[PDB]
Structure 1
């Protein structure tokens, strides 16, 4: 049995872990919305080889996964788990977490994204020749953005993307279930405390993460 202090402690731990590991601070991201790539800078990015853009995008992707791994390591529970389990959850979840995190760097006012110090739109990534993939990411980002997720809602929802007992290949499934259940309490409690119950019915379906992430892979 988990008590009110223990649950409130959990909420606060997951929120603090995200803040430490967030990588890009929200205030900085919002401050930088005014800073938008010039036509010559967009052209510059368009002119680059697919290979250069993939190297850059991969660098950013790998960096953001490290910050996910860290976030996990600070969730009180995760280190107690066995390594096979740690690995299964991160392998299956880490990209799906980056995708949710990425929504903070999307601006719905002008359909731009933060990339390498300023904002621009889809056009930046033309060299990749993955218009469709970029379109999904920009739609999905637009759809999460509409909900104005707080830092703590991100923290908590992100933790549940990771700590999922249905992932094939877990050895201590029951330890993962106990952890997920507690994170579900943490999230649902915090939602009640914040008057934010409305979001649940609007969170993207569990497949849409998995589906889209499949496309990336």
Structure 2
């Protein structure tokens, strides 16, 4: 009952900070829609702008997680910076429309693969779409996506944690919660969803070089929160 209570709370934290694809008004753009280019600055400006907003929403999601507030701000910051890209990647991949081969952002902006590539994903584009495509068969809902996000976040083995053991105990209930929910809702889903964390980490790891490359390409400055996120 306390685990059913935790599950409902995580689902809510997610739903409140992440607009569903079905509850969003999709809109497109014709900017470099059919030709891949190094970087479309107009798409980068819009994309990076939305990235900043989503990062803020991720911090809000984290704050809504039971116990997170309890940890020290130092630990809150370490956990967030280590898992933010993972979560940003999972979020955009959850708004993938296979028929149109597009992904939709929080404000309804819907870009095709080419535009995703041109907005900044570059050489990581196909890798991201493949992750999104492999996500579909799992048919996950708000609570599973939220529990997965929380599992990516609450990791007590992150380096520089002031209270690693306290973090471990906060994640302990998460795996069980997910275990139980998966079997109560749609009766091998447990390990398949968990394996995705690895795929996720693998992709976010490629972000370190990507940001350096983008910085070298843009005429302006890298948005402060993105900077802070990969600044480590």
Report the TM-score when normalising by structure 1: 0.83
Corresponding residue for residue 177 of structure 1: 168
What is the distance in 1 between the residues matched to 2:123 and 2:206?
10
The question of 1:15 aligning with 2:11 is answered: yes
- Structure 2 stretches of 5 or more lacking a match? 209-232
Give the aligned partner of residue 51 of structure 2.
61
Which residues in structure 2 correspond to 1:84-103 (within 5 Å)?
A: 84-103=74-93
Q: Tell me, what secondary structure is at the counterpart of 2:104?
A: strand
Q: Mark the CA change 1:109 to 1:79 in structure 2 (over 3 Å): closer, same or farther.
A: same
Q: Is 1:27 the equivalent of 2:18?
A: no
Preserved contact between residue 42 and residue 123 of structure 1 (Cα < 8 Å): no
Cα gap change, 1:128/1:166 in structure 2, threshold over 3 Å: closer, same or farther? same
1:28, distance to aligned residue in structure 2 (A): 2.1
Contact 1:97 1:158 in 2 (8 A): yes
Q: Give how far 1:62 is off.
A: 1.1
Match of 1:82 among 60, 72, 83: 72
For structure 1, the residue ranges without an aligned partner over 5 or more in a row are none
Cα distance change on mapping 1:109 and 1:128 into 2, 3 Å: closer
| 2: CA distance, partners of 1:101 / 1:130 | 15
Within-5 A mapping of 1:1-217: 5-22=1-18, 24-29=19-24, 32=26, 37=28, 41-43=30-32, 50-115=40-105, 117-125=108-116, 127-128=118-119, 131-196=122-187, 198-203=188-193, 204-217=195-208
1:136-164: per-residue Cα shift (whole Å, max 9, x none)? 11111111123211111101111101011
* Partner SS state of residue 146, structure 1: helix
Q: How many residues in Structure 1 have an aligned counterpart in Structure 2?
A: 205
User: Counterparts of 1:188 and 1:126 in 2: how far apart (Å)?
Assistant: 36
SS at match of 1:113: strand
CA contact (8 A) 2:93 2:132 kept: yes
Cα pair distance change 1:141/1:126, threshold 3 Å: closer
Q: TM-score normalized by structure 2? A: 0.78
